[PDB]
Structure formats: C-alpha cells, structure tokens
Design a protein around this motif. Structure first.
Motif, PDB file in Angstrom:
ATOM      1  N   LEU A  64       0.826  -1.207   0.000  1.00 14.70           N
ATOM      2  CA  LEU A  64       0.000   0.000   0.000  1.00 14.70           C
ATOM      3  C   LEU A  64       0.864   1.262   0.000  1.00 14.70           C
ATOM      4  CD1 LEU A  64      -2.611  -1.433   2.494  1.00 14.70           C
ATOM      5  CD2 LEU A  64      -2.944  -1.122   0.025  1.00 14.70           C
ATOM      6  N   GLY A  65       1.755   1.332  -0.977  1.00 15.59           N
ATOM      7  CA  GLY A  65       2.557   2.521  -1.228  1.00 15.59           C
ATOM      8  C   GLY A  65       3.167   2.391  -2.601  1.00 15.59           C
ATOM      9  N   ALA A  66       3.772   3.485  -3.050  1.00 16.97           N
ATOM     10  CA  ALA A  66       4.525   3.433  -4.293  1.00 16.97           C
ATOM     11  C   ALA A  66       5.885   2.782  -4.103  1.00 16.97           C
ATOM     12  CB  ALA A  66       4.715   4.852  -4.846  1.00 16.97           C
ATOM     13  N   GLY A  67       6.537   3.072  -2.981  1.00 14.33           N
ATOM     14  CA  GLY A  67       7.832   2.504  -2.671  1.00 14.33           C
ATOM     15  C   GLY A  67       7.695   1.198  -1.897  1.00 14.33           C
ATOM     16  N   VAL A  68       8.601   0.264  -2.192  1.00 13.88           N
ATOM     17  CA  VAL A  68       8.543  -1.073  -1.628  1.00 13.88           C
ATOM     18  C   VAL A  68       9.858  -1.437  -0.939  1.00 13.88           C
ATOM     19  CG1 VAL A  68       6.758  -1.900  -3.159  1.00 13.88           C
ATOM     20  CG2 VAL A  68       9.153  -2.068  -3.868  1.00 13.88           C
ATOM     21  N   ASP A  69      10.716  -0.442  -0.672  1.00 13.32           N
ATOM     22  CA  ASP A  69      11.990  -0.755  -0.034  1.00 13.32           C
ATOM     23  C   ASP A  69      11.783  -1.369   1.353  1.00 13.32           C
ATOM     24  OD1 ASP A  69      11.220   2.218   0.011  1.00 13.32           O
ATOM     25  OD2 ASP A  69      12.674   2.226   1.659  1.00 13.32           O
ATOM     26  N   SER A  70      10.711  -0.977   2.065  1.00 15.53           N
ATOM     27  CA  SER A  70      10.458  -1.514   3.403  1.00 15.53           C
ATOM     28  C   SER A  70      10.145  -3.008   3.331  1.00 15.53           C
ATOM     29  CB  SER A  70       9.306  -0.760   4.098  1.00 15.53           C
ATOM     30  OG  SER A  70       8.047  -1.033   3.457  1.00 15.53           O
ATOM     31  N   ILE A  71       9.287  -3.421   2.404  1.00 16.20           N
ATOM     32  CA  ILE A  71       8.970  -4.840   2.301  1.00 16.20           C
ATOM     33  C   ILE A  71      10.151  -5.641   1.740  1.00 16.20           C
ATOM     34  CG2 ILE A  71       7.835  -4.497   0.103  1.00 16.20           C
ATOM     35  CD1 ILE A  71       5.972  -6.955   1.386  1.00 16.20           C
ATOM     36  N   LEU A  91       1.541   0.410  -5.486  1.00 18.03           N
ATOM     37  CA  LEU A  91       0.600   1.394  -6.024  1.00 18.03           C
ATOM     38  C   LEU A  91       1.249   2.194  -7.154  1.00 18.03           C
ATOM     39  CD1 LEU A  91      -1.029   2.614  -2.670  1.00 18.03           C
ATOM     40  CD2 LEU A  91      -1.811   0.848  -4.282  1.00 18.03           C
ATOM     41  N   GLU A  92       0.667   2.105  -8.352  1.00 17.16           N
ATOM     42  CA  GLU A  92       1.237   2.749  -9.542  1.00 17.16           C
ATOM     43  C   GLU A  92       0.424   4.002  -9.810  1.00 17.16           C
ATOM     44  OE1 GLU A  92       1.164   0.314 -12.951  1.00 17.16           O
ATOM     45  OE2 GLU A  92       3.332   0.065 -13.093  1.00 17.16           O
ATOM     46  N   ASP A  93       1.049   5.179  -9.588  1.00 14.76           N
ATOM     47  CA  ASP A  93       0.365   6.458  -9.719  1.00 14.76           C
ATOM     48  C   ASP A  93      -0.750   6.515  -8.670  1.00 14.76           C
ATOM     49  OD1 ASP A  93      -0.854   8.866 -10.393  1.00 14.76           O
ATOM     50  OD2 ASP A  93      -0.718   8.535 -12.541  1.00 14.76           O
ATOM     51  N   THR A  94      -2.000   6.140  -9.023  1.00  9.51           N
ATOM     52  CA  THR A  94      -3.204   6.236  -8.164  1.00  9.51           C
ATOM     53  C   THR A  94      -3.354   7.625  -7.515  1.00  9.51           C
ATOM     54  OG1 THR A  94      -2.276   5.521  -6.022  1.00  9.51           O
ATOM     55  CG2 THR A  94      -2.882   3.774  -7.612  1.00  9.51           C
ATOM     56  N   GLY A  95      -3.085   8.668  -8.291  1.00 11.10           N
ATOM     57  CA  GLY A  95      -3.183  10.049  -7.847  1.00 11.10           C
ATOM     58  C   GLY A  95      -1.873  10.634  -7.358  1.00 11.10           C
ATOM     59  N   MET A  96      -0.862   9.806  -7.188  1.00 15.30           N
ATOM     60  CA  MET A  96       0.433  10.325  -6.773  1.00 15.30           C
ATOM     61  C   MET A  96       1.155  11.051  -7.902  1.00 15.30           C
ATOM     62  SD  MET A  96       1.708   7.371  -4.133  1.00 15.30           S
ATOM     63  CE  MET A  96       1.262   5.904  -4.918  1.00 15.30           C
ATOM     64  N   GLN A 101       3.374  16.320  -9.431  1.00 13.86           N
ATOM     65  CA  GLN A 101       3.371  17.473 -10.326  1.00 13.86           C
ATOM     66  C   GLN A 101       3.076  18.770  -9.564  1.00 13.86           C
ATOM     67  OE1 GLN A 101       0.337  15.925 -12.967  1.00 13.86           O
ATOM     68  NE2 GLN A 101       1.808  15.561 -14.598  1.00 13.86           N
ATOM     69  N   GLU A 102       2.043  18.761  -8.709  1.00 12.36           N
ATOM     70  CA  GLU A 102       1.687  19.944  -7.928  1.00 12.36           C
ATOM     71  C   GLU A 102       2.891  20.461  -7.137  1.00 12.36           C
ATOM     72  OE1 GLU A 102      -1.374  18.303  -5.416  1.00 12.36           O
ATOM     73  OE2 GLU A 102      -2.862  18.314  -7.038  1.00 12.36           O
ATOM     74  N   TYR A 103       3.546  19.553  -6.438  1.00  8.67           N
ATOM     75  CA  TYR A 103       4.665  19.920  -5.576  1.00  8.67           C
ATOM     76  C   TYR A 103       5.829  20.460  -6.390  1.00  8.67           C
ATOM     77  CZ  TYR A 103       7.572  19.012  -1.273  1.00  8.67           C
ATOM     78  OH  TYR A 103       8.413  19.147  -0.175  1.00  8.67           O
ATOM     79  N   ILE A 280       0.564  11.455  -1.162  1.00  5.40           N
ATOM     80  CA  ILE A 280       0.101  10.528  -0.158  1.00  5.40           C
ATOM     81  C   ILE A 280      -0.764   9.474  -0.817  1.00  5.40           C
ATOM     82  CG2 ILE A 280       0.175  12.289   1.684  1.00  5.40           C
ATOM     83  CD1 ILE A 280      -3.009  12.025   1.595  1.00  5.40           C
ATOM     84  N   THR A 281      -0.864   8.351  -0.132  1.00  5.48           N
ATOM     85  CA  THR A 281      -1.742   7.257  -0.511  1.00  5.48           C
ATOM     86  C   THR A 281      -3.180   7.622  -0.172  1.00  5.48           C
ATOM     87  OG1 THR A 281       0.085   5.735  -0.139  1.00  5.48           O
ATOM     88  CG2 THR A 281      -2.157   4.826  -0.103  1.00  5.48           C
ATOM     89  N   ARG A 282      -4.004   7.795  -1.206  1.00  6.71           N
ATOM     90  CA  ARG A 282      -5.437   8.069  -1.084  1.00  6.71           C
ATOM     91  C   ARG A 282      -6.252   6.783  -1.095  1.00  6.71           C
ATOM     92  NH1 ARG A 282      -5.038  12.949  -5.449  1.00  6.71           N
ATOM     93  NH2 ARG A 282      -4.432  14.529  -3.873  1.00  6.71           N
ATOM     94  N   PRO A 283      -7.000   6.471  -0.037  1.00  2.77           N
ATOM     95  CA  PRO A 283      -7.579   5.119   0.041  1.00  2.77           C
ATOM     96  C   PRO A 283      -8.487   4.772  -1.114  1.00  2.77           C
ATOM     97  CG  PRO A 283      -7.440   6.035   2.230  1.00  2.77           C
ATOM     98  CD  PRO A 283      -7.034   7.158   1.260  1.00  2.77           C
ATOM     99  N   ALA A 284      -9.369   5.677  -1.532  1.00  9.33           N
ATOM    100  CA  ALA A 284     -10.329   5.328  -2.573  1.00  9.33           C
ATOM    101  C   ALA A 284      -9.639   5.005  -3.882  1.00  9.33           C
ATOM    102  CB  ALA A 284     -11.331   6.467  -2.787  1.00  9.33           C
TER     103      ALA A 284
END
Ligand code: NAP
Ligand code: NAP
Lengths: 313, 313
Positions: A64-71, A91-96, A101-103, A280-284
């Motif tokens: 449940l993130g874009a990065g998987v270094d923890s797992i 999670l691939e993109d999914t609003g990230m 881009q905004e940041y 951030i990870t958006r649940p929906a």
C-alpha cells in the motif's frame, strides 16, 4: 469468490474493509490479526508482520505505497516471508502522479521567480526588484524516469523548461534528453540547475546524492528530494548549502522519520521541510487500482505495476 | 518612412532606439528631450512629460506597460496633453500572460499544498502531516477577466480547480463561471477560496478590496494582488489577516511604491511581498508588439490593444 486479508499499522482498517467489499462484491475481506492462518487469495499490506505472509501461496500481495523498499528489506532479512511464487505489486500512480506534479511545479516556479530571494529582502523590509532568471539557464534534471518522474517531466515541459532525465534504460520522451546508467551520470548532472529526485531506494542508489554528486552540479543549484531520505547524505548537503553550491533545498523525506529535532536541517536558512507528504496514498484511489488489477490478473491481461524482486524495484 | 520619438524615465534608451531601428528599418527613431518640437508620427512613452505630447497630431501613442492609469490620470489633469484624435495603445500580453501564470500557479499550489502551514511547523522543528485540502473547497475567483485574467484562468483550469471570473461584460469560457457587474459581485465573492486581482485601476475599481468585500469571502481565504495597489484598502486587509478571515496574502503592488518601511505589511506573518515584479515589461517583446501593431495600422487591419479613454482602460 475470493478471500482478501488486509493489514496496515495506522490506516482506518474498517473503512478499507468496507470499501474493498463494495469494489469487489464477491470478495470476503478481513483484517489480519496474529494467529489468523485461515486461507487467503490476496493480501493488501504495509509493514506486514512476517507471520502474516510466511508460508502462504498467495495469488498476489499488494503493497500500500509506491515505494517497496520496506517490504523488500524485510524479505531480505526473512527469506521465508514471501514465497517466490507470490507476485508483488505496488501502487502505480493512483493520484500520486498529479500530487508530485503539484509539488514540483509549485516549487520550481517559486525558485525560478526568486521568491526565496524576495522573502529574504522582505525580512529586512527592503524593496528591490531583482533580475529575471531565464529558462535557458534553468535546465531541470529528473533523477529517476519512472511513473512519477515521467509525470513531473511532462508537467514541467508545459512551462518550457529544458529537461533531462536519468534512469537505467534509455527513454524516448520528445524534448527530454535521456541519460542512462552511472557512466552517464556526470554528464547528466553538469547542466542540472534544479535536481529532482524520484528514484526508488535500492542498494544501487543509496547515498547517491553525496559530496561527489553535488560538486558536479552548476553553481546556485536547487535540490528537490521527493523520493527517499537514504538517497541524500545529509551532512554533504549541509556543506553544499553552507558553501553556496546549492541555493535551496526542499526535502520531503529523510534518513530518519520523523526527522529528529537535533538535525541541522530544520533551522537551516535555505532548507524547506515537508513531513513525507509529497504524494500521499489516497484510500479510494488505491482500492480502485487494486480491484482493477485483481480483475486483470483473473482475465489473464497484462499488468504494469509488478515489482521485480531481483532488480529491487 | 516614419519618425518615432521614445521616452522612458529609467529604461536603456539607447538599446530601445537600436532595437526599434532594426525592427522598423524605414523608421527614424530618436530619444525625446525637452525642447524637441520636431515632427513625429509615433510616440513610445512611460510617464511622458506633458510637453512631449501636447499639441502633437500623432498617429499613435504606445504606453510601455500593460496598465495605463498613470497616463490617463495625467491626461485628466492636463487635458491639453493628448489630442482626442490620437489613439492610445498599451502592451497587450507581450510575455506578461505567461509571467502572471507562473506567479499565480506557483502560489495557488503553494497554499493548496499547505506549504505556509508546514513552514510555520518547521520554524519550531515540529514534524506533523496535515490533512489534504480538496479542489472542491478551493474555488479560485479572478477579479478582472481580460488579457491577463484569461491566461491565469486557463493555466489554473489545467490543475482542475473550480474557477469563476468577474468583469463588466459576460464571458464565454467553458468551465469558468462568469459573473458580471457590481450587482453580481457579492455572489461571485461568496465561493472564492482564492481571490486573484487582475483589474485595471479606474475610478470605478479604486478601493474595491475593502472590509465589505473581504467579509463576503469564505473563512480562511487567500488574496493574490497582482494588479494595482489602489485596489486594496491596506488597513482592511490587515484587519482581515489579524482576525483569521484571510489565511494568507501575496501582494506585488501597493498604494505607495516602494512600499514604505513603516507599513505593517512588511513584517506581518501571513503576508508575502514582491516589488511590482509579477509580470515585467520585456524590451524585445515590447518592440515586436509595437512594430507589428504599427504595420497593422498601416494596412488598415483591426488592432486589439487600444485604450478606450471614455471607459478608462
Ligand atoms: N510522498 C513521497 O515522498 C513519495 C510518494 C510516492 C513515491 N515516492 C518515491 O518515489 C519513488 C519512485 O516511484 P515511481 O512510481 O516513479 O517508481 P518507478 O516507476 O519504479 O520509477 C523508478 C525509476 O528509477 C530508475 N532507477 C532505478 N534504479 C536505478 C539506477 N540504479 N540507476 C538509474 N536509475 C534507476 C528507474 O529506471 P528504469 O526506468 O530504467 O527502470 C526508473 O526510471 C518510489 O520508489 C518512492 O520511493 C515518494
Ligand atoms: N507586474 C504587475 O503587477 C502587473 C503587470 C501587468 C499588468 N498589471 C495590471 O493588470 C491589469 C490588467 O491587465 P489586462 O491586460 O488583463 O487588462 P484588460 O485586458 O483590460 O482586462 C481588464 C479586465 O478588468 C475588467 N474590469 C474593468 N473595469 C471593471 C469594472 N468596473 N467592473 C468589473 N470588471 C472590470 C474588464 O472587464 P471587461 O472584460 O468586461 O472589459 C476586463 O475583464 C493592468 O491594468 C495592470 O494594472 C500588473
């Protein structure tokens, strides 16, 4: 019909369970607790306990993130945790994409328009128009040219900045000069007025933003670290800020999070800190991606966002 | 063949003379000095002395800015200065569109992403992720829907913010709700989370951003004043900032410029000041616009950027 187990250390578990049930109405969804060794087809996880996954012949695991270094780090320490047969997704993109881009656009423009200089002058109640910067002197380099790096490059191309990217394999984006591999990194860095980090954390990229990298940038460069803290050697950055090599740094991630209060970064004049909120990870949106991916897997369609455990991302 | 007289109090007069000669190679171009009553076809001016224009039957006058309140105010005090036969032009866009987009997008995103809140937390070395704002709560209102207001609206529509504009006459922009006239201003203001001022200074708009306007905005609103200082009653703004009605204000223009050091705006915590640099006059682009407009006038083609002296802009 399928069984899904869900685990997250801090998210609203009940909300996720109900959302998944509606998005996948044939699914039986349950929160995972210690001792639960009943059957499951899919696991949705973030910092899973070893026990949750060990020995399970799952059809897939969704991180449940874009990065998987923890797992992946956990798996290296506990090779029994995830059987090699189990495919791992992130999670691939999914609003990230849009969030990055905004940041990046906001802060690149902030520096380009010398808002940091005007703020310093404002602090002394001093009125003084400053010379305009020009795009030709403001090449933006994107370290990492993946799902998020491509989105950031695209949004900045809209503003007509010269752009270059760095990755392991060559890219084809029109108007973005593609550099590839460590053998091309010094040439990549030579023109980067702004350096945007969107690499994954892997053994091959730890500490890459260090004294030797920073010295190759143009004078008065800017750093935007949106990826992982371990990419930056914080004492080397501070030395480059103190010498004037780097004019400003905006950092969303750190070697230790929360960033300890003793870090000199907090109060350093040319540093801006955000607390790992760049995208951030958006649940929906995560629920929609996961349900769509499970459906594609069931239909034997090609899936994008699978982690290559040998490569490390 | 034509004669052009040039006057600007601070620009590089010799550079302009040489650039105009190359862009209009049949033109004889000269800097205007007191006593010069020789013939001229066109005058390019900024804060012209009355003597430079009085009694001249010029084919056109080009004001070297987007705003013309300074020349129109002078003309009202010295009606002999510009004969009614002389058409008056301003700089239309000439790169100021993109500059206003850069400024507005950077700062709208800055506020949307709560960078001002993160900065406050950083000042105390405090790590704390904050809730995301949502676009549906961040309607942007553009006061003034002209050359620059349209460009800003377009760039913000790219980011999917709800948008509305205010002007004297109805606009047709898809996805931007158009409000028109003072009778519709209160309804316009009611939803503006961010208020962007791009009005001209005219007798009908002086002081429009006052206590009565600010009280109609939503709580926690933001002000971006990119137009003229006289639009804002500075003490009313300070009161709205101090009460929490307005969460932040970024101001590029002021009732007096340079903004005097005694102004409370300089050191006020939620105010950001830039010294009338939001969209500067770029000489090369101005020369291209003026030379193209003169050519259109000679060919009897329709010209856009003419000032309506009766209307005041
Ligand atoms: N809030 C936050 O701050 C936040 C939120 C989301 C994500 N992130 C971070 O952003 C990262 C990127 O996400 P993504 O979805 O864009 O990942 P991605 O699509 O996997 O992109 C990774 C990119 O990095 C490049 N790369 C990997 N190892 C490399 C190496 N040794 N040398 C050169 N380039 C290398 C890859 O090259 P190829 O294209 O050649 O494979 C690829 O372009 C995540 O891993 C996460 O750490 C941060
Ligand atoms: N660096 C700086 O800070 C900077 C640089 C450039 C320009 N500026 C300022 O920006 C201003 C706008 O430039 P522009 O080129 O966009 O001007 P413009 O194209 O003339 O646009 C003016 C707009 O304001 C509206 N307006 C005028 N009087 C009004 C009233 N009484 N009620 C409602 N709306 C009214 C007009 O309505 P209609 O569309 O109905 O006519 C029009 O939409 C200039 O006048 C200048 O003061 C500032």
């Amino acid at each position: 019909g399928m069984d899904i187990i869900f685990y997250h250390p801090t998210f609203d578990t009940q909300w996720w369970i109900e959302a998944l049930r509606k998005a996948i109405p044939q699914a039986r969804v349950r929160a995972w607790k210690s001792g639960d060794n009943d059957s499951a087809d899919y696991a949705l996880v973030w910092h899973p306990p070893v026990e949750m996954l060990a020995g399970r012949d799952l059809k897939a695991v969704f991180a449940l993130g874009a990065g998987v270094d923890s797992i992946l780090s956990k798996l290296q320490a506990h090779p029994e945790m995830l059987n090699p047969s189990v495919p791992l997704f992130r999670l691939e993109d999914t609003g990230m994409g849009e969030q990055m881009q905004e940041y990046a656009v906001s802060q690149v423009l902030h520096w380009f328009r010398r808002f940091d200089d005007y703020r310093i002058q404002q602090n002394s109640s001093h009125w003084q128009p400053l010379p305009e910067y020009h795009r030709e002197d403001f090449t933006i380099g994107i370290l990492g040219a993946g799902v998020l790096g491509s989105k950031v490059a695209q949004s900045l191309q809209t503003w007509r900045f010269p752009l270059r990217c760095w990755s392991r394999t060559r890219k084809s984006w029109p108007g973005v000069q593609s550099f590839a591999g460590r053998e091309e990194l010094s040439a990549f860095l030579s023109q980067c007025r702004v350096l945007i980090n969107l690499l994954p954390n892997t053994p091959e990229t730890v500490g890459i933003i260090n004294q030797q990298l920073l010295e190759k940038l143009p004078d008065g460069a800017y750093l935007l670290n949106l990826a992982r803290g371990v990419h930056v050697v914080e004492d080397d950055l501070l030395a480059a800020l103190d010498s004037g090599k780097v004019k400003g740094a905006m950092l969303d991630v750190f070697n230790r999070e929360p960033l300890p209060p003793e870090s000199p970064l907090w109060q350093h004049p040319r540093v801006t800190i955000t607390p790992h909120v760049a995208a951030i990870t958006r649940p929906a949106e995560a629920v929609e991606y996961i349900s769509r991916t499970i459906a594609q897997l069931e239909k034997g369609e090609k899936v994008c966002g699978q982690v290559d455990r040998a490569r490390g991302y």
